[PDB]
Amino acid sequence: MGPMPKLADRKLCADQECSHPISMAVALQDYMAPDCRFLTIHRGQVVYVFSKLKGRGRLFWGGSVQGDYYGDLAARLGYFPSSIVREDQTLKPGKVDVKTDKWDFYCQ
Numbered sequence: 001m002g003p004m005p006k007l008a009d010r011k012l013c014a015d016q017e018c019s020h021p022i023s024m025a026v027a028l029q030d031y032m033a034p035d036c037r038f039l040t041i042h043r044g045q046v047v048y049v050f051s052k053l054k055g056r057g058r059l060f061w062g063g064s065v066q067g068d069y070y071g072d073l074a075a076r077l078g079y080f081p082s083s084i085v086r087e088d089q090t091l092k093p094g095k096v097d098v099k100t101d102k103w104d105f106y107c108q
Contacts, residue, residue, distance in 0.1 A: 039078030
């Protein structure tokens with residue numbers, strides 16, 4: 001909760017809308033979300049990668065988690081480390097460079 005220094009400047013997506021999932025990845029371990037823009041992922045969860053951050057944080061990725069809904073969840077997106085997931089299936093090529101804005105990386 002609050003404004004923190006951006007992990008990166010630009011990311012990669014399947015389209016300029018970043019509404020499509022680049023690759024479907026499986027979770028290998030547990031992860032706890034500290035800040036608002038982070039996502040909590042348990043070992044074995046299904047997580048879809050929507051954007052991959054590069055530059056200042058080429059090791060940090062982002063997307064949504066499929067499995068737990070009970071209301072919303074998969075609609076506000078989040079971020080997670082690449083080291084906790086393994087990509088084996090690509091649903092669409094992530095060759096669209098989209099930069100971030102003021103409203104990104106900011107929770108109220």
